[PDB]
Amino acid sequence: SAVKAARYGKDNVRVYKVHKDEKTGVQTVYEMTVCVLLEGEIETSYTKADNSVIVATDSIKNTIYITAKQNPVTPPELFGSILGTHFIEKYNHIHAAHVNIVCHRWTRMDIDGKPHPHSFIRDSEEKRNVQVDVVEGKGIDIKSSLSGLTVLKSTNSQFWGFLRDEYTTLKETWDRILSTDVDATWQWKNFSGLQEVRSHVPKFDATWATAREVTLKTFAEDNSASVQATMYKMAEQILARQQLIETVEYSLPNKHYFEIDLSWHKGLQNTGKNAEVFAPQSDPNGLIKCTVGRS
Amino acid sequence: SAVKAARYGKDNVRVYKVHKDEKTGVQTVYEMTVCVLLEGEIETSYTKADNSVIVATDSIKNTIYITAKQNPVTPPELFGSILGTHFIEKYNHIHAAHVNIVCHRWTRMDIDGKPHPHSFIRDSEEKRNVQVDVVEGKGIDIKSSLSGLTVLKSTNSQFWGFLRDEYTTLKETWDRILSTDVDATWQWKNFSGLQEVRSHVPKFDATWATAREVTLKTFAEDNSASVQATMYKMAEQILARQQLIETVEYSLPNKHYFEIDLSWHKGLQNTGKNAEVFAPQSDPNGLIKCTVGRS
Amino acid sequence: SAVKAARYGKDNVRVYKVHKDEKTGVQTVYEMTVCVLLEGEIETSYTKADNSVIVATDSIKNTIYITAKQNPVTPPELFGSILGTHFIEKYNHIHAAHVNIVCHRWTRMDIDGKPHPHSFIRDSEEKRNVQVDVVEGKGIDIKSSLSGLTVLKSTNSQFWGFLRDEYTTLKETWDRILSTDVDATWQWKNFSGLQEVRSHVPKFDATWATAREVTLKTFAEDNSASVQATMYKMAEQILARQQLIETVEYSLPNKHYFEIDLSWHKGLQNTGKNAEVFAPQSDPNGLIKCTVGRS
Amino acid sequence: SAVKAARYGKDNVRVYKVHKDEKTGVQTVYEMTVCVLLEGEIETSYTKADNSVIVATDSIKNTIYITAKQNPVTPPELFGSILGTHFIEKYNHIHAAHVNIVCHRWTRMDIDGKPHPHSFIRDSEEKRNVQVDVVEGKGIDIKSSLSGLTVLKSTNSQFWGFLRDEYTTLKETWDRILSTDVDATWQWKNFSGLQEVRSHVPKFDATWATAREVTLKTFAEDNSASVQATMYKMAEQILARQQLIETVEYSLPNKHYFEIDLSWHKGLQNTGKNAEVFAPQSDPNGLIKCTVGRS
Numbered sequence A, B, C, D: 001s002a003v004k005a006a007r008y009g010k011d012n013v014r015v016y017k018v019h020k021d022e023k024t025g026v027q028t029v030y031e032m033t034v035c036v037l038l039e040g041e042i043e044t045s046y047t048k049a050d051n052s053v054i055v056a057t058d059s060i061k062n063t064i065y066i067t068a069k070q071n072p073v074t075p076p077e078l079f080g081s082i083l084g085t086h087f088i089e090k091y092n093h094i095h096a097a098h099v100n101i102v103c104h105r106w107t108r109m110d111i112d113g114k115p116h117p118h119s120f121i122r123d124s125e126e127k128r129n130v131q132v133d134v135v136e137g138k139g140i141d142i143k144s145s146l147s148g149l150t151v152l153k154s155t156n157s158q159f160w161g162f163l164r165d166e167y168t169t170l171k172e173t174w175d176r177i178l179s180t181d182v183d184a185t186w187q188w189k190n191f192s193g194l195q196e197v198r199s200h201v202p203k204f205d206a207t208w209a210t211a212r213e214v215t216l217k218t219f220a221e222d223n224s225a226s227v228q229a230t231m232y233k234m235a236e237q238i239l240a241r242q243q244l245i246e247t248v249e250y251s252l253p254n255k256h257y258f259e260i261d262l263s264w265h266k267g268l269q270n271t272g273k274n275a276e277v278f279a280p281q282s283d284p285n286g287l288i289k290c291t292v293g294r295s
C-alpha cells in the first residue's frame, strides 16, 4: 500500500476578536470558525509511525490564535491567506495549507435610533465564508461565498414547459411560491502569493456586497421561469461587475410550498387564485446547481 | 393501573398563509409551526382500545389548516385562542386544548431602498411564540414569548463579589464579554374565553414589541453586575408597561468567551486590557432563570 | 416588582469517568452531560446586584468534577442525589438543587467474539436520564427515563374506529407501519434523603432494565389498536414490577409512513396488500402522551 | 457568460421498502435517503428559460419510488446503479446521473432471545452510504462508505515525538483516550455498465462487512502511535482483502478528552496515572485524512 493523498489539522476552531477605538470608544467584533488542514512530506506519519513530521494539531490551533492577534481578521480572504502562507513558509516540509473560514454575523445594534458603541446582534445564521488553498509553487486559490441566506417570494415564480412523459405527474403552474437557501460562491483568479492578495484587499468586501445585492434584487424582481433561469441571471451580473472573478457557482434548494385542497370541507376554495394556506414541505426538495464562467 | 393524565394530538404542523391586497398588489406572508394537544374523556382509548373517543390526529391537522383559511393567523395569541376554543366547543368530551405556535420571520425585503411587494427574507432564527391553554370552565391561559434572540456586548459587563470557598477558581472581573440567547416569556392574566382575547388584540403585538425593545436597550445600556441583575431590570420594565401581564420569565445562558494567554509565545500580551482574541466556549454554559411578578 | 421564582447554575457540563481494574486490566467508561441549577435565598442577586449570595456557575462546574472524582457516577440516580445533597448541605442559603443527567452509551466492543478490555462503541443515541430534585426539608424527588429509543414494526398495527365527522379524511386501516422514538419516565416514591436513595441502589439499574425490556417486548408483540392502547400496556406492566415507582409516563410520536399510489404508472399496484414502497414523513407527526398511576 | 457545469435533481427523498416472505411470515425492512442529480444538454434551461430540457425534479422523485418498487433496494451499490442507468438510457440528452444513498439502520429485534419477524430497532445513527456516478460513455463509478461509527478506547493510545517549536504547548503523552467518528470510503474499480455491477453483487455486502470489521478490530487492538498510523493500518488491510477496490479513504476527527487538574482542591490527584475524570471537548477537534492506494 501507499499514501495517495493526505491532509490533517485542526477543525472547528472558534475565534473572536475585538477592535477598540481609543479616540471614540467604538468597539467592533469579529467571530469565525476556522479549519486549517496541511499537506506535505508527511506520509511517514501514516506509514512508519514517524511523528517528527507532524506539526501538532494543537500547535495549529495556537497558530490560529497568534495569527489573529498579530493581523487583521478581515476581510477573511486576507486573514486566510496570511494564515495559510505562514504554514508553507515556516515549515520546509509543508507544501500546502487549506484554510476554511466561516464568519458569523455580529451586527451593531441601533438603540433609540443611534448605533451602539459595543452591543451587537446575530441578525441571522447567514454566513460569509472563504476557502483559501495556499499551495507551494502555485500561489493562492480563493473561493468566497455567502450561505444560509433564506428568502421567499409569494408570487412571480412560474414553472411550465418541462418534459412530460409516463413518469410525470407535476401540474404546470404560472404562479407559485419560490423559497430557497442561497449558497453562492465566486472563484478568484489565482493569486501568485500573499502580496497579490494584499493588493486587492478592498475588492473582497466589495464583491461580497455586490454578490449579495445582485442575489436579492434578482430574486425579488425576476418573473422567474425556473430556479435555473433566475440563478443564471444572478451569476452573469456578478461576473460582469468584477473582472477578477473567473466563475460564480450557485447551489439552490427549491423548498416546496404545496397547495392544500380543502374543497372536501364545506366546499372551501383554497387552490389556484383562491390559494391562501399552504403546507411548507421539509423534504424532499429540488436541488439546482450551476457554475457560470465567461464566454 | 389508571390514567392519571393524558393528552394527544398533532405536532410539527407547518403552516404558511398569504394575504394579497387587491387594491395595491402588496402581499404579506406568515409562517408558523403548530402543535395541538387535546385532553378530555379519552382515557378509554388507552385502557380499553376504544378509539371512538379519538379525534384523529390527522383530523386535528386538517382543522389547523381550515382554521387558518377561515381566520387571521396574526397575532398568534388570537389564532391560538380561536383554534383551541374550536376543539373544546366542537367536541363535548374534549375539555382542554393546548396550542403551541412558533412564528418564523419573513421580513419584507427593501430593494433599492423601497419595500418590495412580495419578496421576503428570514432575518434570523429568532422566533415569536405562544402557548395557549384553552380549558373548559377555566378560560384561556396565554404565555407569549420571544426566543433565539442572540446578542453580544464586548464590554460593560462585570462579575465580582461572588462567594469564594474551596470550590472556587474563577477570577473576579470588572470587564468581560457578555453573550446570550434571549428566551423571554410574559404570562397574561387569565382570559374568560375567546371574546376577552379578542377585546385585547392590539395589546399582543404591542407587548411583544415592548418586550423586545426593553430587552435590547437594557442589554446594550446596563453596566451589568451579573446576568441576574440585568435580566431583572428587563422584567421590571416590561411589567410596568403592560398591566395585563402577571409575570415575566427570562431564561438566559451565559455563553462564555474565555481569554487566551499568549505570553508563552514571544511575550504576546492578550489578557486584561490587552485582550483582543478570545476563545468562544460552546459548552458548558451558565444558565440563569428568573420569574418576576408584581409586589 | 418581586422575584417569584429563581434558579441558576451550570448547564451542558460534559463528564467522562474511567474505572480501571488492577487485578484484571478491564477498563469501564462512563460519560454524561450534567446540569445543576440552584434555588435559595438568592433573590438579592437579581434585585440589588448582590453577588455575595451567588455560588459561581464555574464553581458549580468544579464541584461536579470533584464529586465525580470522589464518588461512583453510576447509577445516575445515586450520583445525582449525592451531587444535589452536597449543595443544599454545604451552603446554608441554598435550599434546592435540581440535577439533570443525560447518560451516553459506551458499550464494550466484542472483537473476534470476546469482550475487549478498553474499547467501546456508541450503539445509538438512546439515552438513559435522571432528573433529581433535592429540596431542603422535602427529601429527594427522582424521575428516571430512557429516551431516543427508535423502533419500527412493519405490520401488527391498526387504527380504525376513530371519530369521523366533517373534519375527517383519514382512512381506517387494519395493517399499517408503526414507528416511534420512545421517551419513557418512571417517577419514584419521594425519598427522605440520601441515605434512603442509597438503600435502594440496585433497584435503579433493575427498573431501567425492566422498563426497556417491557417497552421492546410489548411494542414487538402487541397487535396494536393504537399508540394509546399499546403505551398503556407498557406502563401497567412496569408499575406491576416495581412497587417503589408511583407513575410511568410515555411520550410517543407517531412517525408516519405513507403509502404511495403508483397506479398512474403502468398500473403499478403498491397499496393495501400490495404496498411495498412507502414515503416516511418527517413532519407533521402525531404526539401521544399518558401518565399512568396505580388504581 | 456561459454555463461551465450544471446539475439538478431531487435531494432528501426518504424511501422505505418492506419484503414479506409468504412462506415464513418474516418481514424485512429497508430505509434510505436518496439524492439524484442529472447532467446533460440542459444548459438552455439556465440561459434561455427553455424548460423543455428539464426532467422535473418531481418526476425524478416519482422515478425513485417506481424503481424501488420494481427492483431490489439492496445492496445500495446495485440500486444506485440501476437508478442512474435508467436516467441516462431513458433520456437521450441526459448524459450523467449522480446518485447518493444514505442507508438507515433497522436491525431486527431479539425478543426473549428469538429474532422477531417484523419488529426493528435503530441501533445507532451509523450509516452505510454510496455515491454512484453513471456517466454516458464512461461506465459507473462507485464510492461505498460507512459513517457515523462512534468509538472510544480508554488506553493504548499515545502521541509523542511530534515537532516542537515556539508554537508548541502540547505535552507528549504515552497514555491517552482516543475517540472518533469513523468515515471510511472504498472506491471501486470503474465498472463498464450495469451488467458488470450486477456481476459483483455479493462483493458489496462482503466488502462493507470487511471494512467495518477491520476498522473495529484495528481500533481496539492497535497500540496507537497516532490517528495517522492507526487509520493507515485499517486501509492497508481492506485493500489486501478486496482486489476490486482501488483506494480506501479515512476521515477521522480526534475528539479530545482533556485531563482535569484538581490538585487545587484538597490536593486531589486526577492527572497522569491517577486520571479518572476527564472533560470531553466538543470543539475544536483534530481532523486527520488519508487516501491509501496500492503500491
Ligand SMILES: O=c1[nH]c(=O)c2[nH]c([N+](=O)[O-])nc2[nH]1
Binding pocket: A159, A170, A225, A226, A227, A228, A254, A286, A288, D008, D054, D055, D056, D057, D058, D059
Ligand atoms: O424551478 C424549478 N426547476 C426544476 O427543475 C423543477 N422541477 C420541479 N418539480 O418537478 O417539482 N420543480 C422545479 N422548479
Ligand SMILES: O=c1[nH]c(=O)c2[nH]c([N+](=O)[O-])nc2[nH]1
Binding pocket: B159, B170, B225, B226, B227, B228, B254, B286, B288, C008, C054, C055, C056, C057, C058, C059
Ligand atoms: O452573570 C453571571 N452570573 C453567575 O451566576 C455567574 N457565575 C459565573 N461563573 O462562575 O462563571 N459567571 C457568572 N456570571
Ligand SMILES: O=c1[nH]c(=O)c2[nH]c([N+](=O)[O-])nc2[nH]1
Binding pocket: B008, B054, B055, B056, B057, B058, B059, C159, C170, C225, C226, C227, C228, C254, C286, C288
Ligand atoms: O395510534 C394512533 N392514534 C391516534 O390518535 C391517531 N390519529 C391518527 N391520525 O389521524 O393520523 N393516527 C393515529 N394513530
Ligand SMILES: O=c1[nH]c(=O)c2[nH]c([N+](=O)[O-])nc2[nH]1
Binding pocket: A008, A054, A055, A056, A057, A058, A059, D159, D170, D225, D226, D227, D228, D254, D286, D288
Ligand atoms: O493522533 C494524533 N495526531 C495528530 O496529528 C495530533 N495533533 C495533536 N495535537 O496537537 O493535539 N494530537 C494529535 N493526535
Ligand code: NA
Binding pocket: A087, A088, A089, A090, A091, A092, A093, A094, A095, A136
Ligand atoms: Na514549506
Ligand code: NA
Binding pocket: B087, B088, B089, B090, B091, B092, B093, B094, B095, B136
Ligand atoms: Na368540550
Ligand code: NA
Binding pocket: C087, C088, C089, C090, C091, C092, C093, C094, C095, C136
Ligand atoms: Na442549605
Ligand code: NA
Binding pocket: D087, D088, D089, D090, D091, D092, D093, D094, D095, D136
Ligand atoms: Na442519455
